[PDB]
């Protein structure tokens, strides 16, 4: 099936330009999906309306909605005029991350896009607490669109966890790869790279195990991870030369490699509290995200159950 | 009572230099408290120990603890030698923010200090998801120590919410002021400033109310907020000239004023989910924090109940 057929764009109320919207329109052009431009304003309406009657407060709340609706429509004017299918929805909500996830579930959206600021090209992208909540808890993929362009020739870098999940099978790695291949093809035939990081105990600690040679162990673990990378890449017909296996935690490995490859986007998987390796996967994702200088795509398992309540 | 008598310093495992520790030692010198240098390492120990036996894994986990203990002690060597009371504790934990709050509650700590990075003096301080969790949920005050020095003459800027809480009284404003005065005195006699922001409905929206003059309304609200600022400042013997009442949401007002005043620290109150104006106070705090170029101190109500579980 065509991917990203029902995109939810989170509008940034603090600036006219909307990178997330502009990205969604490009995706409409490439893959054909529809778009909901959604603005959940955190609810400061009561503080804004001190001394007013309840009827006046209602009127002011409604006027804000109508005006913001008009402002979005202005931003999207030529898109709309051209036939791009963009529905505009503005609400007040006590918790914007909750409103977005509830809108995802209610509207059956299959992608969320939201902008993130980058102040300097040598500095990490800035993520807000709303960004973090979404990334952690949204059931659909979340694409954080940095407010700076992709590098020409930019790569897509997929982080895969190659440690054995015996007796189970890692279905998430396959999803990340499959989904990234499909996306990358549509995005100017972007070249997809895979990276498996392998952490090991510091040499000067492991050297204390009796008769134990930490570099021999490390090479063992490297060998295993290379085997698993080879299995994964061959399942998807991916060349060896675009796969990367490196010693370290993911956060020690991925940022340097992303800078080396000029990644346009880094793709990461995380899982629910009940899933295998959930605490590790969440923390390492956070540590990697904290270093990223490019777009981020987080994808979760098919049957991920968000802990956000429905109404 | 002497304040901050049992400080918990969160150690940053990724660098030798510890701004949070250095800050705690200064506070020991000024106010006399003891210090726990606490390092909760997110638990990647199982991924780090692929193919090892359970006994070997135990040994590696323990070796990490011992080595990190030694590394902290090295960082703190002259402090320790000089008689500064610094207890060192290193643990593995699945969720570092939880481990820190649990340590706060178990050890009866009355302050948490943690470093935050600032990449550029013209750019906001960077806050990690662990920082955010702590700020939201830690029952003790949290002092985020940016990794850059205070400006000479730096001010302490306290954000107070002056909207009437009729029929209740705002006890949190008083706590923030009282606590900031006590702290500021000890920190080189730092000059304390108060800021109340007053949001109002956009003129071009409120102008739609019949017979309604939005600038007359705005002035009304300004007058009220000035009255309330005057009451608060007089309770604490604070001069009018170090109080500031300005139209806008807090996040529209405070960052510019902090830059104008060269604030060394901005002090903010937030409350539990059950408290009055909880959603507004949380969101506006986040929006302000997202813009800060200086240290942050968040304080909560005396009977705040953290939603983090005890064991």
From Swiss-Prot, chains A, B:
| InterPro entries, sorted | UspA
> What keywords were assigned to this record?
Cytoplasm
User: Would you say which domain of life the source belongs to?
Assistant: Bacteria
The terms describing its cellular component in GO are: cytoplasm
Q: Where in the cell is it found?
A: Cytoplasm
Asked if the keyword Metal-binding belongs to this entry, the reply reads no
Could you tell me which PANTHER family the record lists for this protein? UNIVERSAL STRESS PROTEIN E (PTHR47892:SF1)
The family annotation for this protein states: Belongs to the universal stress protein A family.
| Function of the molecule | Required for resistance to DNA-damaging agents.
- Name of the featured protein: Universal stress protein E
What is the organism of origin for this protein? Salmonella typhimurium (strain LT2 / SGSC1412 / ATCC 700720)
Phylogenetic placement of the source organism: Bacteria, Pseudomonadati, Pseudomonadota, Gammaproteobacteria, Enterobacterales
């Amino acid at each position: 099936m065509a991917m990203y057929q029902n995109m939810l764009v989170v509008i940034d109320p603090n600036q006219d330009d909307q990178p997330a919207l502009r990205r969604a329109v490009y995706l409409h052009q490439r893959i054909g999906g529809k778009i909901k431009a959604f603005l959940p304003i955190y609810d400061f309406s009561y503080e804004m309306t001190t001394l007013l009657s309840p009827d006046e407060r209602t009127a002011m709340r409604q006027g804000v909605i109508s005006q913001r609706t008009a402002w979005i429509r202005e931003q999207a004017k030529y898109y709309l005029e051209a036939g791009v299918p963009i529905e505009i929805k503005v609400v007040w909500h006590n918790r914007p991350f909750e409103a977005i996830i509830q809108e995802v579930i209610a509207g059956s959206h299959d992608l969320v896009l939201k902008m993130a600021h980058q102040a300097d090209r040598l500095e990490a992208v800035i993520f807000t607490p709303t960004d973090w909540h979404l990334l952690r808890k949204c059931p659909s993929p979340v694409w954080m669109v940095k407010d700076q362009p992709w590098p020409e020739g930019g790569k897509a870098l997929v982080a895969v966890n190659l440690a054995s999940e015996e007796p189970y099978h890692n279905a998430l790695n396959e999803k990340l790869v499959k989904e990234t291949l499909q996306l990358a093809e549509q995005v100017n035939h972007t070249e997809v790279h895979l990276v498996g990081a392998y952490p090991v105990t510091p040499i000067n600690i492991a050297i204390e195990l009796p008769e134990f040679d930490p570099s021999v162990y490390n090479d063992a673990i490297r060998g295993q991870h290379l085997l698993a990378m080879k299995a994964l890449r061959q399942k998807f017909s991916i060349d060896e030369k675009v796969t990367h296996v490196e010693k370290g935690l993911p956060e020690e490995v991925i940022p340097d490699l992303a800078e080396h490859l000029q990644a346009g986007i880094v793709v990461l998987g995380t899982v629910g509290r009940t899933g295998l390796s959930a605490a590790f996967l969440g923390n390492t994702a956070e540590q990697v995200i904290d270093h990223l200088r490019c777009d981020l795509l987080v994808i979760k398992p098919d049957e991920y159950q968000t802990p956000v309540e429905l109404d």
